[PDB]
């Protein structure tokens, strides 16, 4: 890729766009459409549940904004403690993977600020690519566990903050490609 003068702006604006989209998605208490309830006892019978991983809500009910935070409930003959079931519940009952992706991408933002502070450290921008890829992995694994639980039919449909979270992965890959161009430029500078 040419235009190395603009590539620093293009990568930083892409990274900031990804960070804003991801943080809005994780802050938002809903991700994608489904049917169910807003809050248990549109409360019991019928509403579009605007599902989400960390928090969940609803849209176009007789009432709106009565959102909910994830919890768990018992089932017949238990089986809650099973090696698969307890694993799935312990994963699903936490905001781990999206908020870790947020933290990694924000530290990617703090990393690229080392283009101006602690300047001329060259290959240190290596850490940006690590942050982009690890944020991507955390995002995709979060979406995988989210959909894998949520898809159990409840007529799900994809929503705005979902589109933000998913798009942030592709943005993070394109930003990563530019960050690798930045790194290998710093490498060619170090080797002359």
């Amino acid at each position: 890729l040419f235009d190395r003068g603009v590539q620093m702006l293009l990568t930083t604006v892409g990274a900031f766009a990804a960070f804003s989209l991801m943080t809005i998605a994780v802050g938002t208490d809903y991700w994608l459409y489904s049917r169910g309830v807003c809050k248990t006892k549109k409360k019991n019978e019928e509403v579009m549940t605007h599902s989400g991983l960390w928090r969940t809500c609803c849209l176009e009910g007789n009432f709106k904004g009565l959102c909910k935070q994830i919890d768990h409930f018992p089932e017949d003959a238990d089986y809650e403690a099973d090696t698969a079931e307890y694993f799935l519940r312990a994963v699903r009952a936490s905001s781990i993977f999206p908020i870790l992706s947020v933290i990694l991408l924000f530290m990617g933002g703090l990393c690229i600020a080392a283009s101006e502070f602690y300047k001329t450290r060259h290959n240190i921008i290596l850490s940006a690519g690590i942050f982009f890829v690890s944020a991507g992995l955390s995002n995709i694994i979060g979406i995988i566990v989210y959909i894998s639980a949520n898809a159990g039919k409840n007529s799900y449909s994809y929503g705005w903050s979902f589109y933000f979270g998913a798009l942030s992965f592709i943005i993070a890959e394109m930003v990563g490609v530019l960050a690798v161009h930045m790194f290998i430029d710093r490498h060619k500078q170090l080797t002359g």
């Binding site: 018992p74 089932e75 017949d76 003959a77 238990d78």
Partner: protein, 51 residues
């Protein structure tokens, strides 16, 4: 041992009808096992909600 439990467990585990035993099982989410004639058991299993 099961008799020693049933003769000592409380609230009284025994039921006056199969309908009551079924109710106690369903309320208990299977934490209560009702002991009954096989004809009753395999009747009820065929009756919805068939849980």
């Amino acid at each position: 041992k099961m008799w020693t439990y049933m003769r000592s467990a409380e609230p009284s585990v025994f039921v006056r009808t199969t309908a009551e035993g079924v109710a106690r099982v369903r309320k208990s989410k299977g934490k209560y096992a009702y002991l009954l004639e096989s004809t009753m058991n395999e009747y009820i299993e065929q009756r919805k909600p068939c849980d």
